[PDB]
């Protein structure tokens, strides 16, 4: 085990050996965007793809053209930090090399005329952070991956569209990535139709005529042949035995000299095999059998040269006679069946109004552009530009691939444009499905649902930008001079930059990151959405898509999705799941060869998985042999049953892979109903980090993985010894073996301190190492906000008893001990951001002065000379933060104000009163202030003091960098000089500034001195240019919005303690609101005297079927029992030997504990540091489905000398008497949700009113009135309460006269009703007359 794990080991009850460890949890976001910026040379990707797609572009004249060479991302002007503080996007400039080439029109392609090549800027593209976010306008935002219908082909059918007939109409749909949709479909009369972009319906054969197919060729394509020879007098027919199947013999079937079937006799399997084996080719038939057979090709009389019968025409006795007498004695009929080979195309040609190719192109043209006069040029152009033009049609690799596999082709890759083969093949397969061979696909199948991560979407918007610019470019290339015009004079950046900012900004998929919790971040970044552009709508979504699909197994969580209207469409990715190269979801599986289960792993796509039989992970392995039991439980074709051992092809890698990250953290999930578990995994994400990060006693093991992979924890890049610990930073000196030979080899991690989150929670990093500690690479150096020693700590475990109490836990209501409040463990930190804007108005600039009309010296005490509140100052509602006002003009002062200002003397000033003050009822401490000034407005004296701070602090920061880096670098040269001429203390005597002159013999070590000398000077100049940059940014008059001269941002901090109305929950979907905080004296307490922290209501268990919470409580108690026993042995100080014995016996308890942990390897000191942490309670892991069993938990309870029942004797705190029966008591790990009552309580008598309707505004942020809605109105109507209702319609809402008059009556005690007409009705009237409808009031 590792060094950070030596400090505290989690006890594992898992029994399945882990073949595959949890991958990096933030894979998707980073790989995708990495592919977008990754410049690929051949196989175009992201930007490269976008340029190669649009470029090279030529002018309308064709003589001038713009070609693309190469692009580069400039390095970001402001880093993530400065972007977040300033409120600007973290981006890189896009510089693109472009070559203007011009052709001569006199020479054929005179390419050597004018070639102008230069590097043009067009837009800054946002960069992805180390943790898969973008900083847009100073706020971390996540672009959630999307789930959409894969381009390709799809066969579907409404099962009984017209409920009257109830006939199944089959259809095909060819879905491209870019271009028009091509639909094929059946009607009731079995006629094949084609529609483009669901336009007006057309006979399917018309499109074939557009591809130049004559009627003869169309029939040759979809139908077989039936040949008729006319010999002597009798009619003869060419036979294929297995045509005459499931049929009635209509005439006497005989051949050479054997009668097989009589008239009106069923031709079964037997007759068919008889005829086939007899080798029958020709049969004599009645002439009357032909009446109704359809002739395939044309026949003309060679003599006259006129049509005897046209193709697709029903034959009669007279046509046949005329055909014979002309000299045609080989009639070709169309083999058409009504049970197997349906005559669809045949009937559709009779419906087809078109004749030749041009007639078909015209009719197509006339569909999409109706009424507009056709031309041949227009018809040909439109049809080629539909599905046959490189420009307007592209299936993409994915589309062509899925298309070819659906049509059973061999070839994966190919053309984005539809070939004639493609269209026909699709029609053919649609017809096969109508015949009964083949099946329709379904859309919910993950083989048809593809995942689109950010990079592909950024690429798409970027293409749009390039297309818009391309319009401008072609238009300016046309009218442009050839010589004067530079390439960059034709390009505009605004359109590209606008398309991309519109994506990362307007888009539904780009949203404010949810960051009130490490788990909330990591789950939000692994989110999949079926919504947004190119997706479904909440309104448009049925129920089929929403529900859990068999293909979701091991790919998507069944138990993670919002209980909103977004219930089916938003979904978290499964743990081990990954994005296929083409974009399909895939899951790891262990290959089983000859019954022996190999450790080779294979990721199977949705489609591949269906073909094999996969064993479940719960199968018992015979210790690297095969399955123990001769029957194994497996699944294939999406359905589950028993199989033999050698039949099994694969097996589930992990027990965990079915569930997502969020769900994987629920212990005993196996014992919780899926509904409750859903709510549990959803609410765990809303857990606010407490002041004290408390580890969970009852974990799963994913805790460590989540905490580390989320990136919120500082982890060690390279192992070594810690040179310097600090609250603000950590310096680690790297070990010689990992430590590179160039640099000094000392890593410095500066820790991010108390900063604001998007939910106004507090982000702080605490150092979790000691000064001078040996550290392994990839260990946790510093804990993030909700993490303890590298494990995830979302809330706090505590002593819980399940029993009713005087109704204070009625419906989920929670009774909590004051002790918890006192210990400040559920206490939380909230950081709010208030800003004060000095704008330029029509009248003049606003000033940020402390000199404000009508202000008490009490108020001005907290503002400095500049008018900004001091750091550290406690403020409450109405206190002024930043002294800012707005200029005002002339104003008729009422005679009373004339009088009043004459009494006081203080006349009104120019600027009015618009100073930023603390919002009402919010109260906090100022922890920081930021000032933005523009370029050339006279700076505040305070802004100057803040610049002095930043400058000297910057100087100190960079000075300490070069000092620690120089000390570490010469410390290496000192060791290099010893290898060769060791004079340790003799070399250190004379000054260190005169050191790098001293050399060594001409060896690799002399070259090491040269490396360290070159880098020492590199750092010397680098320090200069770095400090210049810092100083420039500190001096830099930030570029603000037009009109705004300077902006002051105050950051308030608030300490909020738990109180009644706050929302708390466990991880089993057990919600509750605190009802009461009880005095410790009143809390139920045990015989030992220790009082409970929380009393939860047991009536919230049997109905809910979330028994996870009870098992968690029992095991939590057992964990705390072991903790109390180690705590007792440490208080006594028995000795290392005895502690070691107990702890070994404890770790190696469980029936089949996977993890063995020998204490004989642990040194005595290592043992003591471990026991020290385990005294709070021994941390235990219950993997999801591979968890602790009842027997194991009771055994652990017995090691704790706790009862098997986990129920204990409790005593009422008030009375002292015992409760009538044992109560279940233990430790449930509990979370304080973001729903604080401080944020929810709101109240209003009278306030601002809406603009047109005159009714009060909505929402607590706008100081809003409650909506009394139609449903609420009806209640008063039922009651008969007429005045209450009228009141709410009039004096309370619109009635403007009524409200003021009523107010005055209320202050005069008289509660008189003085109503009139609501102002919204007056508006209604005006709106209806504006429509030109006379609506008048007839009075009495």
């Amino acid at each position: 085990y590792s060094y950070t794990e030596k400090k505290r080991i989690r006890k594992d009850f898992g029994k399945r050996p882990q073949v595959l460890d949890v991958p990096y949890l933030l894979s998707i976001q980073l790989d995708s965007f990495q592919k977008f910026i990754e410049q690929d040379p051949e196989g175009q990707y992201g930007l490269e793809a976008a340029f190669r797609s649009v470029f090279p572009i030529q002018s309308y004249s064709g003589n001038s053209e713009l070609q693309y060479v190469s692009y580069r991302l400039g390095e970001p002007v402001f880093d993530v930090q400065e972007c977040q503080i300033r409120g600007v996007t973290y981006s890189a400039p896009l510089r693109v090399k472009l070559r203007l080439v011009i052709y001569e029109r006199e020479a054929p392609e005179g390419t050597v005329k004018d070639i102008k090549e230069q590097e043009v800027y067009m837009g800054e593209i946002p960069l992805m952070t180390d943790n898969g976010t973008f900083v847009i306008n100073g706020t971390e935002r996540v672009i959630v991956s999307q789930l959409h219908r894969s381009p390709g082909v799809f066969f579907d059918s409404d099962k009984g569209k017209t409920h009257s007939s109830g006939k199944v109409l089959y259809n095909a749909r060819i879905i491209p990535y870019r271009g028009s949709w091509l639909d094929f479909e059946f009607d009731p009369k079995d006629n094949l139709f084609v529609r483009i972009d669901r336009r007006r319906k057309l006979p399917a054969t018309i499109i074939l005529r557009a591809l130049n197919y004559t009627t003869e060729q169309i029939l040759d394509l979809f139908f077989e042949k039936v040949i008729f020879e006319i010999r002597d007098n009798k009619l003869q027919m060419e036979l294929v035995p297995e045509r005459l199947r499931g049929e009635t013999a209509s005439f006497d079937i005989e051949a050479n000299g054997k009668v097989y079937v009589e008239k009106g006799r069923r031709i079964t399997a037997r007759h068919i095999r008889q005829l086939e084996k007899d080798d029958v080719k020709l049969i004599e038939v009645p002439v009357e059998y032909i009446a109704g057979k359809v002739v395939a090709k044309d026949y003309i009389d060679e003599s006259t040269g006129e049509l005897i019968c046209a193709a697709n025409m029903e034959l009669s006795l007279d046509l046949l006679a005329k055909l014979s007498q002309s000299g045609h004695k080989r009639i070709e009929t169309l083999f058409t069946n009504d049970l197997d080979h349906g005559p669809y195309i045949s009937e559709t040609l009779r419906v087809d109004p078109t004749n030749d190719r041009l007639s078909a192109l015209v009719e197509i043209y006339r569909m999409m552009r109706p009424g507009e006069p056709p031309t041949r040029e227009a018809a040909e152009s439109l049809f080629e530009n539909l599905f046959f033009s490189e420009d307007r049609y592209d299936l993409s690799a994915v589309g062509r691939m899925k298309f070819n596999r659906s049509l059973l082709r061999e070839e994966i890759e190919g053309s984005g444009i539809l070939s004639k083969d493609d269209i026909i093949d699709v029609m053919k397969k649609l017809i096969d499905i109508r015949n009964g061979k083949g099946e329709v696909d379904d859309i919910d199948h993950l083989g048809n649902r593809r995942i689109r991560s950010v990079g592909e979407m950024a690429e798409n918007q970027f293409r749009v930008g390039l297309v818009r610019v391309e319009r401008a470019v072609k238009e300016r290339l046309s009218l442009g001079d050839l010589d004067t015009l530079m390439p960059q004079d034709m390009i505009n950046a605004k359109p590209i930059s606008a398309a991309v900012k519109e994506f990362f900004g307007s888009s539904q998929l780009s949203q404010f990151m949810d960051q009130n919790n490490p788990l909330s971040e990591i789950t939000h970044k692994r989110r999949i959405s079926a919504l947004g552009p190119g997706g479904l709508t909440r309104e448009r979504a049925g129920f089929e898509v929403r529900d859990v699909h068999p293909t979701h197994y091991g790919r998507v969580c069944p138990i993670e999705t919002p209980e909103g209207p977004n219930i089916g469409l938003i979904n978290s990715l499964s743990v081990y799941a990954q994005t296929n190269e083409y974009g399909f979801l895939e899951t790891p599986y262990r290959k089983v060869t000859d019954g022996v289960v190999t450790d080779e792993i294979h990721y199977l796509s949705a489609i591949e998985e269906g073909n094999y039989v996969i064993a479940q992970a719960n199968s018992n392995l015979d210790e690297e042999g095969h399955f123990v039991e001769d029957l194994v439980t497996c699944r294939s074709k999406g359905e589950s049953s028993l199989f033999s051992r050698d039949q099994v092809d694969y097996m589930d890698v992990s027990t965990q892979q079915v569930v997502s990250v969020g769900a994987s953290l629920i212990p005993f999930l196996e014992h919780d109903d899926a509904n409750r578990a859903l709510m549990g995994a959803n609410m765990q994400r809303q857990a606010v980090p407490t002041l004290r990060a408390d580890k969970p006693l009852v974990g799963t093991g994913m805790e460590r993985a989540v905490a580390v992979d989320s990136g919120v924890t500082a982890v060690a890049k390279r192992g070594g010894v810690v040179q310097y610990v600090d609250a603000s930073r950590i310096v680690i000196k790297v070990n010689e073996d990992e430590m590179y030979p160039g640099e000094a080899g000392i890593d410095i991690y500066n820790l991010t301190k108390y900063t604001r989150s998007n939910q106004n929670t507090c982000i702080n990093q605490m150092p979790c190492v000691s000064l001078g500690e040996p550290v392994e690479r990839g260990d946790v150096l510093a804990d993030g906000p909700s993490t303890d020693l590298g494990e995830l700590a979302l809330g706090q475990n505590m002593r819980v008893a399940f029993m009713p109490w005087n109704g204070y836990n009625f419906e989920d209501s929670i009774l909590v001990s004051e002790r918890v409040v006192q210990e400040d463990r559920f206490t939380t930190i909230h950081i709010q951001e208030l800003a004060c804007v000095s704008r330029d108005t029509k009248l003049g600039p606003e000033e940020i002065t402390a000199d404000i009309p009508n202000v008490g010296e009490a108020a001005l005490s907290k503002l400095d000379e500049s008018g900004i509140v001091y750091i550290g100052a406690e403020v409450t509602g109405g206190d002024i933060l930043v002294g800012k006002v707005t200029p005002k003009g002339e104003t008729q002062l009422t005679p009373e104000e004339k009088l009043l200002r004459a009494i006081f003397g203080e006349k009104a000033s120019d600027v009015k009163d618009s100073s930023l003050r603390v919002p009402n009822g919010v109260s906090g401490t100022v922890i920081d202030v930021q000032v933005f000034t523009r370029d050339g407005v006279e700076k505040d004296k305070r802004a100057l003091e803040i610049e002095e701070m930043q400058l000297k602090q910057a100087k100190k920061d960079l000075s300490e960098e070069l000092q620690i880096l120089e000390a570490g670098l010469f410390s290496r040269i000192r060791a290099v000089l010893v290898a060769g001429g060791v004079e340790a203390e003799k070399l250190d005597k004379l000054p260190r500034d005169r050191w790098l002159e001293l050399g060594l013999t001409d060896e690799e070590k002399q070259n090491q001195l040269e490396q360290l000398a070159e880098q020492y000077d590199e750092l010397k100049h680098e320090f200069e240019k770095k400090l210049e940059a810092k100083r420039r940014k500190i001096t830099q008059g930030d570029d603000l919005a037009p009109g705004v001269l300077k902006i002051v941002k105050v950051y308030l901090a608030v300490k909020r303690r738990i109180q009644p109305g706050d929302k708390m929950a466990g991880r089993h979907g057990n919600k509750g609101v605190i009802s009461k905080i009880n005095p410790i004296e009143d809390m139920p307490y045990d015989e030992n005297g220790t009082p409970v922290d929380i009393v939860l209501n047991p009536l919230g268990v049997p109905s809910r079927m979330n028994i996870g919470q009870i098992l968690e409580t029992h095991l939590g108690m057992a964990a705390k029992g072991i903790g109390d026993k180690i705590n007792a042995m440490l208080k006594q100080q028995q000795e290392v030997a005895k502690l070691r014995e107990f702890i070994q016996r404890a770790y190696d308890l469980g029936a089949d504990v996977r993890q063995k942990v020998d204490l004989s390897t642990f040194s005595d000191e290592e043992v003591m540091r471990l026991a020290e942490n385990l005294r709070k309670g021994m941390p235990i892991a219950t993997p999801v489905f591979d968890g602790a069993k009842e027997a194991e938990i009771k055994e652990l309870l017995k090691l704790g000398d706790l009862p098997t029942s986990g129920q204990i004797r409790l005593y009422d705190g008030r009375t002292g008497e015992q409760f009538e029966r044992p109560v279940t008591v233990g430790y449930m790990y509990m979370l304080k949700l973001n729903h604080l009552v401080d944020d929810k309580m709101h109240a209003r008598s009278t306030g601002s009113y809406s603009l047109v309707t005159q009714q009060p505004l909505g929402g607590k942020a706008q100081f809003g009135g409650q909506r009394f809605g139609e449903m609420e109105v009806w209640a008063l109507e039922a009651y008969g309460a007429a005045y209450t209702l009228q009141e709410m319609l009039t004096v309370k809402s619109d009635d403007v006269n009524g409200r003021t008059k009523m107010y005055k009556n209320i202050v005069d005690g008289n509660h008189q009703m003085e109503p009139g007409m609501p102002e919204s009705f007056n508006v209604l009237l005006k709106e209806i007359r504006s429509l030109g409808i006379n609506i008048e009031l007839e009075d009495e």
């Binding site: 009373e896 009494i903 037009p1042 809406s1250």
Partner: protein
């Protein structure tokens, strides 16, 4: 049948014959001299030119149909002011009028708050300057960076970029949820709510009641000056119109009424309490 206004109009123009140079000159000679037919034939023949140009000036302010009407008006001015005797072709001349008339109309109607051509053209030269600057400065250009390039006042540049701030629609909803928009949050500021209205009623009734408790002459010299009880707000010298007819005695009695009323507010419990107000 085509009921698209556009396709119908385009059909109509399609079926009028394109002119040669000599036809143009012959028609146009009679057209300047006032031939109803001549002007009509030249216009109707050259409508197709109008549409070709209006198609290049699209996706900007108005729609295609809108552009085409203003373009037609440009072609009309061209036919009115065409010179047949000059060897130069008509198509060349008309191009100018159509582009001109379209551009000028797209400057007055494209903006909800009408910007005069002077402001608009100023702004446009600042904008094209900004484009060149952005193409060598990678990052977008500041107000001072543009001003530095033109050698012109920073306030001039910033005031013009302020006018470029485009309108937002009241009815456009916020938050992807088509629930509440700007109208639904934007409060009536002009008309204040009943707490302030009722405060003013109490204030005005307080001073009226204070005059009844003050000297009759002091209440008939202080109220009628401020226009509290009188009809018109008079000044120190104007109180001579009523009965006072004095300049010194009016000024002493106004302030004597104020001194006794200041002690009435110190005792009731306001004075410095209602100073912050």
């Amino acid at each position: 049948r085509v009921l698209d206004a556009t396709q119908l109009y385009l059909g109509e123009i399609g079926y009028s014959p394109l002119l040669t140079a000599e036809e143009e000159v012959y028609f146009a000679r009679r057209a300047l001299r006032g031939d109803v037919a001549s002007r009509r034939r030249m216009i109707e023949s050259n409508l197709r030119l109008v549409v070709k140009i209006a198609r290049r000036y699209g996706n900007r302010g108005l729609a295609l149909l809108d552009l085409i009407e203003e373009g037609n008006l440009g072609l009309i001015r061209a036919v009115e002011k065409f010179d047949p005797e000059r060897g130069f072709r008509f198509s060349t001349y008309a191009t100018w009028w159509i582009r001109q008339t379209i551009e000028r109309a797209i400057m007055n109607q494209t903006r909800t708050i009408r910007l005069p051509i002077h402001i608009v053209k100023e702004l446009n030269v600042y904008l094209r300057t900004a484009r060149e600057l952005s193409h060598k400065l990678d990052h977008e250009p500041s107000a001072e960076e543009i001003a530095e390039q033109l050698d012109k006042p920073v306030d001039d540049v910033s005031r013009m970029l302020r006018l470029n701030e485009r309108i937002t629609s009241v009815d456009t909803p916020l938050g992807g949820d088509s629930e509440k928009a700007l109208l639904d949050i934007l409060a009536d500021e002009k008309e204040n709510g009943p707490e302030d209205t009722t405060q003013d009623d109490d204030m005005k009734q307080s001073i009226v009641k204070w005059l009844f408790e003050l000297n009759a002459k002091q209440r008939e010299v202080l109220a009628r000056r401020f226009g509290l009880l009188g009809y018109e707000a008079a000044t120190l010298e104007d109180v001579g119109r009523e009965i006072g007819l004095t300049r010194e005695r009016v000024r002493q009695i106004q302030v004597e009424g104020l001194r006794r009323l200041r002690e009435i507010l110190q005792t009731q419990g306001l004075n410095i309490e209602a100073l912050f107000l």
